[PDB]
Design a protein around this ligand. Structure first.
Ligand SMILES: Nc1nc2c(ncn2[C@@H]2O[C@H](COP(=O)(O)OP(=O)(O)O)[C@@H](O)[C@H]2O)c(=O)[nH]1
Ligand SMILES: [Mg+2]
Length: 323
């Protein structure tokens, strides 16, 4: 073994996170069903919360793997979807007529988080409003990330075939599709995927890496950046956030919603003292997620980061909506 255990054979990654974004009741969940060939029944508004569907297709030899992220009505309303928007990904912006010109709002939003990630704009519900159009030449020039506009109808199944062909084509052209990994990096990845924990500390991640061939920090830090962008974990490089490596996205959101929908916080005009978090994040019943006291800082600072929270002093924070 010692003689031939220095280098390693490198397979291609071929994975991308696809983020369905846009206003609530626009067509995101419906469009996702059409891409996977699940049809349309009219009752897809009943499906809410974080839904991650794993999809794949074979282009020639290459086995392409896709991770669709679908954000529910609570996610867009409370803006908790911001936690999962990442670079080196692909974005699908779903729009509709009823909300007049909200596209440029979303394009600036995707630009700030997505970076160089390509965007495909879907003009949904043309059966309800045929005349619905956008100034395409203006938008694609101002936002080079836009690769195409598509008038579609998830109800009548119009324009999905054309949209799906462009999606497949642009998915192959993403920058990190050509990038290739060592065998150990895939073993770390697949280990994390099969784990059922809510999160892991940065010590535990380094141990999992040690277990596998990669033991040097430089390589370990490059791997989490990928794993974050691929959607295997949810990780941030801020000093107050970097310890928590979230494996279950619902752990974060349900913790934030408990704070936002706290009846004790409703009174007091939304002033959140950190002594109150014990009662709010306590395990009541029926599979409530466990929130350790050491992760109180994570949740609060995470909410502060994306402007769901504003600091009054060092021990308290404000919720403007409850004021
Ligand atoms: N007529 C029509 N209805 C649609 C179309 N797409 C979605 N809908 C319906 O309008 C609502 C949109 O919600 P939906 O796409 O399921 O969830 P969300 O976009 O992720 O918030 C649902 O009741 C869908 O059945 C469409 O293209 N045409
Ligand atoms: Mg939805």
């Amino acid at each position: 073994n010692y003689f031939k255990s220095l280098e390693g054979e490198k397979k291609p990654l071929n994975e991308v996170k696809v983020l369905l974004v846009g206003d609530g009741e626009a067509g995101k969940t419906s469009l996702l069903k059409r891409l996977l060939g699940e049809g349309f029944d009219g009752n897809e508004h009943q499906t809410q919360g974080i839904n991650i569907k794993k999809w794949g297709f074979k282009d020639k030899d290459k086995e392409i793997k896709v991770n669709f992220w679908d954000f529910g009505g609570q996610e867009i309303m409370h803006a908790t979807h911001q936690f999962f928007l990442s670079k080196r990904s692909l974005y699908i912006l779903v729009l509709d007529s009823r909300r007049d010109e909200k596209a440029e709002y979303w394009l600036k939003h995707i630009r700030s988080f997505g970076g160089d990630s390509p965007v495909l704009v879907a003009l949904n519900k043309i059966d309800e409003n045929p005349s619905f159009e956008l100034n395409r030449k203006f938008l694609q020039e101002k936002y080079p990330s836009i690769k195409g506009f598509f008038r579609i109808s998830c109800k009548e199944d119009r324009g999905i075939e054309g949209f799906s062909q462009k999606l497949k084509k642009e998915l192959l052209k993403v920058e990190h599709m050509q990038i290739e990994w060592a065998k150990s990096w895939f073993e770390v990845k697949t280990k994390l995927e099969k784990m059922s924990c809510n999160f892991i500390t940065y010590e535990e991640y380094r141990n999992i890496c040690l277990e596998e061939n990669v033991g040097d920090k430089s390589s370990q830090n490059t791997l989490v950046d990928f794993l974050n962008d691929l959607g295997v974990i949810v990780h941030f490089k801020d000093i107050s956030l970097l310890d928590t490596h979230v494996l279950e996205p619902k752990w974060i959101t349900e913790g934030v919603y408990k704070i936002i929908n706290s009846e004790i916080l409703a009174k007091k005009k939304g002033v959140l003292r950190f002594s109150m978090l014990d009662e709010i994040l306590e395990q009541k019943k029926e599979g409530d997620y466990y929130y350790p006291p050491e992760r109180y800082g994570y949740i609060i600072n995470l909410m502060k980061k994306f402007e769901l929270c504003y600091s009054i002093d060092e021990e308290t924070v404000l919720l403007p909506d409850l004021l």
